[PDB]
Amino acid sequence: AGVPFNTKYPYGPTSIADNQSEVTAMLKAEWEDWKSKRITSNGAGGYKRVQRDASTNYDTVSEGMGYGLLLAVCFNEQALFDDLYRYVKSHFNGNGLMHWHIDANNNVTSHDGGDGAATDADEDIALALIFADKQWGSSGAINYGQEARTLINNLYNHCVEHGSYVLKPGDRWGGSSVTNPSYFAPAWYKVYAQYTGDTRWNQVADKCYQIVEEVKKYNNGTGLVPDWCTASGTPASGQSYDYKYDATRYGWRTAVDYSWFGDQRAKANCDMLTKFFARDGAKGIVDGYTIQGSKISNNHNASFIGPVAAASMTGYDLNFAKELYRETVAVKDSEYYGYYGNSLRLLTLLYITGNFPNPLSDL
């Protein structure tokens, strides 16, 4: 079970790794490294949690739990998965969604609405539970399927704007006036629809593509999306409208929709994004651009490489894709800031090596 999955994506390439035989050993080593640095029982209330790095004093954000659960199930670590999930369950708010911010002492933060939920985190946690149900079954200590069905319902009821199907960034704010393209996970929603029978999720997926279609009027054909925007693709008041640390995840979530479902809107969007980055090459990728393409920051790090390699999966240029795979493996952030970028690096590596199959397919 788990890595290596030995499965083939129904659309596009299954892997862009140059040496398929060494990939498995590499993934396992990177996972062991991630595990030792990120997983801790300190401040976990008797379970385990994914901690951020020294830069934020080893706190925990729900986003980290989503990443950790997806990685734990893909690497077939059931005992770890269960302990991480018990921590999540001990942090479900009044709406049945996870507190987004908790300190290293297990206290929810009050200055930043830490008790509210962040949509991208819970959607990742829900997908991880589906993988768990499919891989291991739900007759053990935790009934993954039931937990998944419950979380998906809460996600729809509190994180989707009724009537418009616009994805909200949290359970208590946003929607048409402010949403986050990097949270758009059409492949996840299609899986939710098929897994639960709730077809409303397909509408949410379509609405995500319609919003990005609006963004295309302002990005000058670069394929770049803003960190935040309204449902009209315009700037959200007081929120970044540039392609920075949030937006970088868009290429990864979108590419998966092409690999799993062959969605042509996904290919069109990812090919555009890949073509933009092809101008400067794999080494030229920096950590900040306006959506029209101007460089606004100049650091080359792990938060921005892997997502572009993921986007290259849709087939703009398979030679450039190999260079991007090589760069993704090569660039690993220092430990002081080792949480975010290194987590995205490992998730994208699973995907681009053919190790992130649709959990509803034949595993």
- The residues spanned by each domain of the chain are 1-363
Nearest to 88 by CA among 52, 128, 35: 128
Helix, strand, coil percent values for the chain (each to nearest 5): 50, 5, 45
Q: What 3-state class would DSSP assign to 130?
A: helix
In DSSP terms, which residues pair with 39 in a beta bridge? 50
Phi, psi of 164 (to 5 degrees): -95, -25
The answer to whether 225 and 236 are in contact (CB under 8 A) is: no
Residues 286, 308: Cα–Cα separation, whole Å: 11
| Final resolution, Å | 1.6
List residues with catalytic annotation. 63, 120
- Tally of residues, the chain: 363
Question: With contact defined as beta carbons under 8 Å apart, do 152 and 198 qualify?
Answer: yes
Residue 297, amino acid? S
Torsion angles phi and psi, residue 332, rounded to 5: -130, 130
Strand 60-61 relative to strand 49-50: parallel, antiparallel, unpaired? unpaired
Counting Cα atoms < 13 Å in the Cβ hemisphere of 79 gives: 0
DSSP state at residue 245: T
Query: What tokens does 30 get?
Result: 């990177």
Place of tokens 């959506």: 291
Both tokens of 107, joined, read 């206290």
The span from the CA of 126 to the CA of 148, in Å, is 5
Tokens of 341: 């970028």
CA distances from 12 to 62, 241, 258, 312, 350 (A): 32, 31, 8, 10, 16
Contact 99, 115 (CB under 8 A): yes
CB 280 within 8 A of CB 317: no
Q: Read off the tokens for 329.
A: 């493996």
- CATH no. of 1-363: 1.50.10.10
Residue 96, Ramachandran bin (φ over 0: left; ψ between -120 and 50: alpha; else beta)? left
Distances in whole angstroms, Cα of residue 135 to Cα of each of 1, 130, 144, 223: 7, 9, 10, 35
Going by the DSSP 8-state scheme, the letter that residue 40 receives in this structure is E
CA gap 159, 339 in Å, rounded: 26
What's the rounded Cα separation, in Å, for the pair 82 and 68? 11
In whole angstroms, what is the distance from residue 136 CA to residue 43 CA? 28
Q: Give the residue among 340, 336, 289, 329 at the shortest CA–CA distance from 305.
A: 329
Paired tokens of 225: 């999306």
User: What are the tokens at 338?
Assistant: 């080792």
Six-digit token string for 98: 């996870």
**Residue 248 DSSP symbol:** G
Amino acid at 261: F
Which approach determined this entry? X-ray
